[PDB]
Structures are given as C-alpha cells and as structure tokens.
A paper describes a structure:
Inositol-1,4,5-trisphosphate receptors (IP3Rs) are ubiquitous Ca2+ channels predominantly localized to the endoplasmic reticulum (ER) membranes. IP3Rs play fundamental roles in the physiology of a diverse array of organisms as they mediate the release of Ca2+ from ER Ca2+ stores in response to diverse physiological stimuli. Each IP3R subunit comprises the pore-forming transmembrane domains (TMDs) and cytoplasmic (CY) domains containing binding sites for ligands and multiple modulators of the channel. [name] and Ca2+ are the primary agonists of IP3R channels and both are required for channel opening.
Hence, the cryo-EM 3D reconstructions of the nanodisc-reconstituted [name] channels were determined in the presence of saturating [name] concentration (10 μM), ~2 μM Ca2+ and 1 mM ATP (Ca2+/[name]/ATP-bound [name]; CIA-[name]), and using 20 μM Ca2+, as the sole ligand (Ca2+-bound [name], Ca-[name]), at estimated overall resolutions 3.50 and 3.26 Å, respectively. One conformation, hereafter called ‘extended’, was observed in the apo- (ligand free) and Ca-[name] structures. By contrast, in the CIA-[name] structure, the ARM2 domain is moved ~30 Å towards the helical armadillo domain 1 (ARM1) from the same subunit and exhibits a conformation distinct from that observed in the Ca-[name] or apo-[name], which we have termed ‘retracted’. In the CIA-[name] structure, we observe a strong density bridging the βTF2 and ARM1 domains at the site where [name] is expected to bind. Superimposition of a single subunit from the apo-, Ca2+- and CIA-bound structures shows that [name]-binding causes rigid-body movements of all three LBDs resulting in a 4 Å closure of the cleft between the ARM1 and βTF2 domains. By contrast, in the CIA structure, only two cytosolic Ca2+ binding sites, Ca-IILBD and Ca-IIIS, were occupied with Ca2+ ions. The CIA-[name] structure reveals a previously unseen ATP-binding site located at the interface between the ILD and LNK domains, where clear density is seen. The resolution in the ATP-binding site was sufficient to unambiguously identify the pose of the ATP molecule as well as coordinating residues in the binding pocket. This pose allows for the formation of hydrogen bonds between the negatively-charged ATP triphosphate tail and residues K2221, K2224, K2633, N2637, W2639. In contrast, only one W2639 side chain conformation was detected in the CIA structure, likely owing to the compatibility of the binding pocket to the ATP molecule. In contrast, in the CIA-[name], the diameter of the ion pathway at F2586 constriction is ~11 Å. This pore expansion is achieved by 50° rotation of the F2586 side chain away from the four-fold axis and down toward the ER lumen.
Author numbering:
A (entry chain B): 2173 to 2479, 2521 to 2654
B (entry chain A): 2521 to 2606
C (entry chain A): 2414 to 2461
D (entry chain A): 2221 to 2268
Write the structure that this text describes.
C-alpha cells in the first residue's frame, strides 16, 4: 500500500504524506550511525530550482575533499532566501514581474541587437525620406516579405511573433521614418530596462541587506550602468548603443570561459609584453647608435589647402625612433627590415645590416610574439582539465558521504538510489532548516 | 582620372573597410590607412589607435579563435585513447 | 566539382579532423561575433 | 563481419559503466538484419 498511484481510490493521502516526509543518516559521539525520518518544514517548499542548481554547481571541495563545510556555510543564505520569497509569493504583481526575469532579459537583448544593426547600417540619416533604399526598395520588398514565413514553418509561435514585430517595424521604417522609429525603440528599451531593474531588485531582495550591500554588489551596478548607457544613447547620441553589445559576454557562458583563459593567467602575459617592449627598446638604441640615417620612412601629407618631399626622418629623437620600431616593426610580418630602407651590397655595413634584421626578427617575432600566444593554449589546456575534473567529481562520487560510484556495486543499493532517498543533499537542508524554526521544548 | 576614393563617408562602408582591409592585413588596420606625418596634432593618437587595434584584435581574438581548435584536438585524442584502452 | 566533397565521407581521418572545429563550434561562432563587435567599435571611433 | 565490427565499435558505456544495455537495444536490429539477409542469400542477382 505504500507505493503511490494506488488503483483503489484514496491514494491522495499516501502521496501527500510521502511528498513531505524526508530521511537522512547521521552519526553520534560514539561513532554509531542512526537513520532518521521526520516531516519536512512548510517553508522549504518555496526553494527555486535555479538556486538548487547554483548550490549544486558552485560548491567546491575543501582541502580534505569534502563539500560539507561550504554547503553548510550557504545554509543561512538559502534560509533567508526562502523567508523573503514566501513574502513574494503572497504579494501583488511584483511577483508577476519577478517571475519573468528571463523574458525581460531576452527582450532587452533582442532589442539592443536589432536597434544596433540599424545604427550600423543606416548612419548617417541625411537621406531617409521616401524609401531610404531607393534602388534597393524593389529588392527590399521581396526580402522583407520572404523573411517572415520561412522561420515560422518548422518552429513555434514566438519566433513568428518576432517576425510580426519585424514586419511592423519595416512597414514604418520608410513610411513613418527611421529616426522616429529609433527614438521609439530607444524609449521602449529604457522602459524595459527599468522594469528589469525593478524586477531584479524585487527578486533578489537587496533591500534587506542595507544600502552599502546593495551598492557594493557587482551585478546591480552592472545592470545600472547600461540603464545609464541607454539613457545617454537616447538623449546624447545614437552611437552609445554600441557599448550595449558588451552584454553578450555576460549573457553567454562559453564566451566567459573563452575570455577567462587570457585573464586567468594574465600576469605572465603582461610580463611577456613588458619583455617585448624591453627588447624593442634595446634594438631602438642600437639602431639610433649605428643606423640613424637608415630610418627613412615614406609618408604622404594632408591636402595642404591652408598650407614637395616624400620621406621624413624618424630617428632624430630617441622617443620617435622607438615609436618607429614599436609601430612599423612589430606589426610588419618580417621584422623591422621591411620598413627600413634597403641598402646595397656595397655598403660597409651591409653585413651588419643583415645581421641586425635577422637578429631582430628571430628574437622578437619568432620568439616573444609567439611565446605570448603559447600561454593562451596552456590556459585552454588547464581550463579543460579543471572542468573535466569537476564534472567527473559531481557525476561519480556522492555529495555528502563521498563514496565513489563503484563502492556501491552489487550491494542491493543502486548508487543512483543511494542518493535519491538515503543520502539526498536537500533533506539535510530541510532538516537543518526545521531545527532553526521548531521550538526547543 | 582620380586614384583615391573615400571609404568612411557612410558608417556601413566604413565598417566594411575595417572588416575587409584590416582583418586580412597582417598588421592591423594601420597598413591600409594613410600614414600621417609626425607634425600632425593627432599623430600620437593615431599610433595609439593602430597599436591598440592590432593588439586587441590580431594578437588576441584572431588567435584565441585558433587556440580552441588545438583544445579540441587534445580533447578528441584523449577520448579516442580512452575508448581504445577500454 | 561538388562530387569531390565525397572525400570526407569516404575517409575517416578527414572526418575526425573536421569534427574538431564543429564539436566545439559554439565558442568559435561566439568568438567570431566578439571580433565583429570589436571591429564595429573601432569603426565607430575611426568614423568619429 | 561488418555488422560485427560496427556493433563492437559504436557501442558506448552507460552511466554506471556497462555496455550491456546498449548492446541489448541493438539485438532487434541484428535479428531483423539476419532475417532480411537470409532472403537475399536465396535471391537472384540482387545478391551479386
Ligand atoms: C551580421 C551579424 C548579425 C548576427 C545576428 C544574429 C542572429 C540572432 C541569432 C539568435 C540565436 O539563434 O543565436 C543565439 C546566439 O545569439 C548570438 O549571440 C547573437 C550575436 C549577434 C551579434 C551581432 C553583432 C551586431 C553588430 C553588427 C555591426 C544562440 O541561442 P540558441 O540556443 O541557438 O537559441 C536562441 C535562444 N535565444 C533566442 C535566447 C538566443
Ligand atoms: C563608442 C562611443 C563613442 C562616443 C559616442 C558618440 C558621441 C557623439 O555622438 O557625440 C559627439 C561628442 O563629441 C565631443 O566633442 C567629444 C566628447 C567625448 C566623446 C568620446 C569620443 C569617443 C572616444 C573614445 C576613446 C559629437 O557631439 P554631437 O552629438 O554631434 O553634438 C554637436 C552638435 N553641435 C555642433 C550643434 C553642438
Ligand atoms: C562597479 C564596476 C562594474 C564593472 C562591471 C564590468 C567589469 C568586468 C570585470 C569583472 C569580471 C567578472 O567579475 O565578471 C564575470 C562576468 O561578468 C562579465 O565581466 C560581464 C562584463 C560585461 C562588460 C565587459 C565586456 C567584456 C570586454 C563574473 O562575475 P559575474 O558578474 O557575477 O557573472 C555572473 C555569472 N553569469 C554570467 C553566468 C550570470
Ligand atoms: C580582449 C580583452 C580580454 C580581457 C577582457 C576581460 C573583460 C572581463 C572578462 C572577465 O571575465 O575576465 C577577467 C578580466 O579581468 C580583468 O580585470 C579585465 C581585463 C580588462 C580588459 C583588458 C584589455 C586588454 C587589451 C589590451 C579575467 O579573469 P578574472 O575574472 O579577472 O579572474 C581571474 C583570477 N585571477 C584574478 C586570480 C587571475
Ligand atoms: C592582457 C590581459 C590582462 C588581463 C589581466 C587580468 C588580471 O585581473 O589578472 C591579474 C593580473 O594583475 C596584473 O599584475 C595587473 C593588471 C591589472 C589591470 C586591470 C586590467 C587591465 C588589463 C591590462 C591593460 C592576476 O595577477 P595578480 O592579481 O596581480 O597576482 C597573481 C595572483 N597570485 C599571486 C595568486 C598568483
Ligand atoms: C600603447 C602604446 C604605447 C604608448 C606609447 C605611444 C607613443 C605615441 C607617439 C608619441 C611620439 O610619436 O610623439 C612624441 C611626443 O613627445 C612628447 O614628449 C610625449 C608626449 C605625448 C606622448 C604620450 C602620449 C601617450 C601617453 C599615454 C599612454 C597610454 C595611452 C592609451 C590611451 C587609451 C614626439 O614629439 P615631437 O616633438 O613632435 O617629435 C619631434 C622629434 N624631434 C624633436 C627630435 C624633432
Ligand atoms: C560575410 C561578410 C559579412 C557581410 C557584410 C559584407 C557587406 C558587403 C559590402 C556592403 C557595402 O559595401 O555596400 C553598401 C550597400 O548598402 C546597402 O544598404 C546594403 C545592401 C547590400 C549589403 C548586403 C549584402 C550582404 C548581405 C548577406 C550577408 C551574407 C552573404 C553571404 C552569401 C553567401 C554600401 O552601399 P552604397 O550606397 O553604394 O555606399 C555609398 C555610401 N554613401 C551613400 C555614404 C555615399
Ligand atoms: C582610440 C584612441 C584614439 C582616440 C583619440 C580621441 C579622439 C581624438 C580627438 O580628436 O578628439 C578629442 C575630443 O575629445 C575626445 O572625445 C575626448 C578624448 C577621448 C578619451 C581619450 C582616452 C580617455 C580614457 C577613457 C580632441 O580633444 P583635445 O585633444 O582634448 O583638444 C583638441 C581641441 N579640439 C577638441 C577642439 C579639437
Ligand atoms: C538531407 C540533407 C543531406 C545533407 C548531407 C550533407 C550534410 C552534412 C552534415 C551532416 C554531418 C554528419 O551527419 O555526417 C557525418 C559524415 O558525413 C559527412 O558529413 C559527409 C558529408 C559530405 C559533404 C560535405 C563536405 C564537407 C564540407 C556522420 O554522419 P554519417 O553520414 O552517418 O557518416 C557515416 C560514417 N562513415 C563516413 C564512416 C561511413
Ligand atoms: C571548413 C568547414 C568546416 C565545417 C564543415 C563541416 C561539414 C560536415 C562535417 C561534419 O562531420 O562536421 C560537423 C559539421 O556540422 C555542421 O552543421 C556543418 C557545418 C557547415 C559548414 C560550416 C562553414 C564554416 C565556414 C565559414 C561538426 O560536428 P557535428 O557532426 O555537427 O556534431 C558535433 C556535436 N555537436 C553538434 C553537439 C556539437
Ligand atoms: C565555424 C564552424 C561552425 C560549425 C557549427 C557546428 C554546429 O553544428 O554545432 C552547434 C553550434 O550551433 C550554433 O549555435 C548554430 C550554428 C548552426 C549553423 C549550421 C552550420 C552553419 C555554420 C556557420 C556558418 C553546437 O552548438 P548547439 O547545438 O547550438 O548547442 C550546444 C550543445 N550543448 C548545449 C549541449 C552544449
Ligand atoms: N549526495 C548526493 N550525491 C550525488 N548526487 C546527489 C546527492 N544529493 C543529490 N544529488 C543529485 O542532485 C539532485 C538534486 O536533488 P533534488 O531535490 O532535485 O531531487 P528530486 O526532487 O528527487 O529530483 P527532481 O527535482 O530532479 O525531480 C538529486 O536528484 C540527485 O540527482
Ligand atoms: Ca607597417
Ligand atoms: Ca608567430
Ligand atoms: Ca588588404
Ligand atoms: Ca596569430
Ligand atoms: Zn551518500
């Protein structure tokens, strides 16, 4: 009778009591283990799945190889989160706003992208009246008509709603005008961003931790900066919408992992850049001493108008002569010899010139400019190894007991069940929670 | 007759200029743009612009693309050797 | 000419070599998008 | 023999480290293959 889904009517009670009943295993002072069962609290049913996943992933092993300490240190945060979220469940439309964080973020990004493509394509707006693309209007019509239907065929409605939005925009780009359309979309984006900020403050509950806490957090100031940026973009210049594209690295995780390779080990990268600059300085010194007259660069002058010569000397002062090497030597693919004047074989210093060019090329372009790159591949290797190790740990061993997948073999406990009911990591949280709420009597 | 055309009149064409003649060139965008004299008020800013473009794009991103491919070779070889051992 | 594309299907080493770029193609595409974003910003500065 | 090698290579370990489940899931395909191939053995030049 204990198995749910009973054929005889009246199995609602058994299921309802099975849902609120948990079970753990603890130890005593005398190293004796005891099996414990008692009902879960009412407050613990308010935990969100996103918090479950965040706690499941961000927890890290300690020195001895136990996630128990860090898991316990996060219990207070989860308790406060549930206490605050219960109020939100029994609260007005603020809950409706807080439930749609993903929707607001998606609309904000799909706005910013489409309202930056227009700026990139059509600026400046000197000619917009009467079919901005005068020769392409015939080419515009069929493309705009054929864009919508193709997406919606093998795909649900929301992308069709996006296509309808695109149709509504394109029927107004040349009729109403492109600049009023951009102003309307900018105002829309500011409205959506302020709604998203309000929703984020509502969901996070930053107000309970004080002013200093809600101004010292990275994410809130992060979201406020692009509210300010959208305000400036609508009020100062349409080019400020370009900075909004930097949210792409935050929205995606693979981009964050890719970028983290260059900055996880950025100190050797910076020091290698400094070493390259030192080498460039030494070569500039040698060139200033010996080949000062060989530093002749071709240059074209601006239209004189207000007010012939074609070559200027660039090693007159040692700073300018360093700038020459640092600009035209590193960028050129064949060392500094590509930009410097090429001598004849009759020169007294022709052999020294060839030695100088080859030595510069081999020490800088071959060695240092590529030793910089080698570090990046090293950090990819390190990051992949770390990620695979974490994945193996989570998918093989147990969160609390720490026993690996094989030890639970043959024994009538299928590991995959050893964790489902016996050593479940969330029953421990529920039982810790109820201790903090039940009276001591 | 004329030999030079302006390519930053409209911002789309001026993006196309960088995306075509900047990425393909081995030394950043400074190879294709006109090279100024040292007497320009913005000569130092011009050098800063060229070096910054080169270092952020050609050195960093265009090679961070390639690093991923070698990472996937390492991953694939490890997987294949593991299967063969099993 | 399009018939030469059967070479990757006939051989296995070519398939394994090509599979490296597409097994993890999402970060490659996103890095290309990042490069395009940087190019856009530099074009804006140059236009200004 | 080609089916033998394909089953030997394409089978992959499960979460617990056992190829038994996937090997069993391919049994029906092999049975149907043998049933259909017996007809081909006793068939005209289509077998050639
Ligand atoms: C010219 C470049 C124009 C590129 C336009 C991108 C087209 C939108 C692609 C949307 C989607 O397919 O790609 C997503 C990735 O989007 C890309 O990052 C878009 C970046 C493009 C930025 C172009 C820079 C514009 C500057 C032009 C100068 C991957 O997510 P996915 O799992 O597949 O399912 C969609 C789920 N969504 C809707 C929540 C995203
Ligand atoms: C990427 C962001 C770059 C800056 C966004 C564009 C800023 C632009 O829209 O404003 C310019 C601002 O130019 C300012 O002189 C420079 C201020 C600082 C701007 C930073 C330039 C980017 C350098 C980044 C390093 C021009 O001002 P404008 O809207 O036309 O008003 C002038 C109209 N008048 C002549 C009638 C008065
Ligand atoms: C106050 C100053 C605010 C400055 C914000 C931008 C500075 C970027 C340096 C911080 C880098 C790091 O702290 O941010 C990382 C990620 O943030 C990125 O730096 C986004 C920065 C976007 C602007 C920079 C464009 C890249 C060039 C991780 O922190 P977090 O914010 O918790 O990420 C949340 C995890 N998610 C993404 C999965 C939800
Ligand atoms: C191309 C530019 C690459 C760097 C841009 C990075 C923007 C934010 C992305 C962020 O997630 O990456 C961090 C970027 O942090 C940097 O402070 C931001 C770099 C500022 C931009 C550099 C410009 C270089 C171009 C010249 C690097 O890792 P970090 O989250 O810090 O923690 C690593 C652990 N450490 C500190 C112990 C090593
Ligand atoms: C090129 C990309 C450079 C990205 C730098 C990423 C930075 O955040 O990482 C720090 C690099 O710090 C640098 O020394 C100073 C750079 C800080 C400049 C902020 C970003 C500007 C990027 C350069 C332009 C890590 O080094 P650091 O924290 O020092 O001490 C090492 C940690 N140990 C001691 C445990 C090993
Ligand atoms: C990043 C790259 C590293 C920064 C160094 C780049 C230097 C830019 C070029 C500077 C040089 O070309 O100008 C000198 C300017 O010299 C000045 O003393 C130096 C002041 C200006 C240089 C500093 C500007 C860059 C400092 C900021 C570094 C980081 C900038 C990053 C901003 C985002 C020459 O002055 P000038 O007199 O005509 O030359 C005539 C030579 N004579 C006299 C022998 C005939
Ligand atoms: C892949 C590469 C990424 C795609 C972008 C490449 C863009 C091709 C060059 C487009 C540009 O050069 O032409 C513009 C054309 O502008 C049009 O509005 C754009 C329509 C045509 C551009 C779209 C063609 C590419 C879209 C398809 C992308 C993928 C194609 C892949 C096919 C296999 C300029 O028009 P025009 O007027 O003369 O310029 C005069 C400037 N004035 C007015 C200031 C004097
Ligand atoms: C990218 C590096 C190159 C960008 C160089 C800035 C734009 C070049 C310059 O023409 O714009 C400045 C106009 O202001 C800029 O928009 C502000 C400088 C951009 C910020 C530089 C780095 C700041 C770190 C953030 C010039 O102002 P300034 O040299 O002052 O005085 C000259 C007198 N004027 C203004 C009448 C011509
Ligand atoms: C209906 C649309 C048909 C389109 C066919 C070509 C699309 C290629 C994308 C699919 C890639 C993948 O599915 O194909 C791989 C292999 O197929 C390759 O894509 C061949 C494609 C050749 C044409 C593309 C040229 C490469 C550019 C593995 O599938 P499979 O077909 O089972 O391989 C059999 C295993 N063999 C080769 C050892 C016998
Ligand atoms: C150079 C072009 C390289 C890509 C051509 C690939 C042709 C078919 C070869 C096929 O075997 O590779 C796949 C190619 O699949 C792609 O759909 C075909 C790519 C289309 C051609 C890209 C052109 C890029 C040049 C710009 C990549 O792996 P896939 O079999 O998908 O499964 C990986 C597992 N995932 C999906 C979970 C990551
Ligand atoms: C450059 C080569 C690009 C090859 C793309 C290979 C593609 O098939 O791989 C997919 C890349 O998808 C891209 O986002 C969309 C590209 C699809 C375009 C078809 C081939 C055209 C190549 C680009 C030109 C894998 O990413 P996705 O399946 O999304 O989700 C990741 C799987 N997770 C969630 C389990 C981690
Ligand atoms: N100690 C542990 N060792 C290993 N994995 C664990 C452990 N505790 C929990 N897990 C895994 O993390 C998941 C999170 O537990 P959760 O409360 O979500 O379980 P559930 O309610 O039975 O499952 P679901 O909500 O997915 O239907 C578990 O289902 C299990 O897969
Ligand atoms: Ca050069
Ligand atoms: Ca190299
Ligand atoms: Ca070129
Ligand atoms: Ca490179
Ligand atoms: Zn356990």
């Amino acid at each position: 009778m204990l198995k749910p889904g009973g054929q005889v009517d009246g199995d609602e009670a058994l299921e309802f009591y099975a849902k609120h009943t948990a079970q753990i295993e603890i130890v005593r002072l005398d190293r004796t283990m005891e099996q414990i069962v008692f009902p879960v609290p009412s407050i613990c049913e308010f935990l969100t799945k996103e918090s479950k996943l965040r706690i499941y992933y961000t927890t890290e092993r300690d020195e001895q190889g136990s996630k128990i300490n860090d898991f316990f240190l996060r219990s207070e945060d989860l308790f406060n989160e549930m206490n605050w979220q219960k109020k939100l469940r029994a609260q007005p439309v603020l809950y409706w706003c807080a439930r749609n964080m993903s929707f607001w973020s998606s609309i904000s990004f799909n706005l910013a992208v489409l309202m930056n493509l227009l700026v990139a394509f059509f600026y400046p707006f000197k000619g917009v009246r009467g079919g901005t693309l005068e020769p392409h209007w015939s080419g515009l019509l069929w493309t705009a008509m054929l864009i919508s239907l193709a997406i919606v065929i093998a795909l649900p409605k929301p992308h069709g709603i996006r296509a309808l939005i695109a149709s509504t925009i394109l029927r107004l780009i040349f009729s109403v005008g492109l600049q009023p359309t951009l102003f309307l979309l900018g105002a829309f984006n500011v409205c959506n961003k302020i709604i998203f900020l309000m929703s984020f403050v509502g969901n996070c509950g930053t107000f309970t931790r004080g002013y200093r806490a809600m101004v010292l957090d990275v994410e809130f100031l992060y979201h406020l900066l692009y509210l300010l940026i959208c305000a400036m973009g609508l009020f100062v210049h349409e080019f400020f919408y370009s900075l909004l594209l930097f949210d792409l690295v935050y929205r995606e995780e693979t981009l964050l992992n890719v970028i983290k390779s260059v900055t996880r080990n950025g100190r050797p990268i910076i020091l290698t850049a400094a070493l390259a600059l030192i080498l460039v300085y030494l070569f500039s010194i040698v060139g200033y001493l010996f080949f000062k007259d060989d530093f002749i660069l071709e240059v074209d002058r601006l239209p004189n108008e207000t007010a012939e010569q074609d070559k200027e000397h660039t090693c007159e002062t040692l700073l300018m002569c360093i700038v020459t090497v640092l600009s035209h030597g590193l960028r050129s693919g064949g060392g500094v010899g590509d930009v410097l004047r090429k001598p004849s074989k009759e020169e007294p210093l022709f052999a020294a010139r060839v030695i100088y060019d080859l030595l510069f090329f081999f020490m800088v372009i071959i060695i240092v400019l590529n030793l910089i790159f080698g570090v990046i591949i090293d950090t990819f290797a390190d990051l992949r190894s770390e990620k695979q190790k974490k994945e193996e740990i989570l998918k093989t061993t147990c969160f609390i007991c720490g026993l690996e997948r094989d030890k639970f073999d043959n024994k009538t406990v299928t590991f995959e069940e050893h964790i489902k009911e016996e050593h479940n990591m969330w029953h421990y949280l529920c039982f810790i929670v109820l201790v903090k709420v039940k009276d001591s009597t």
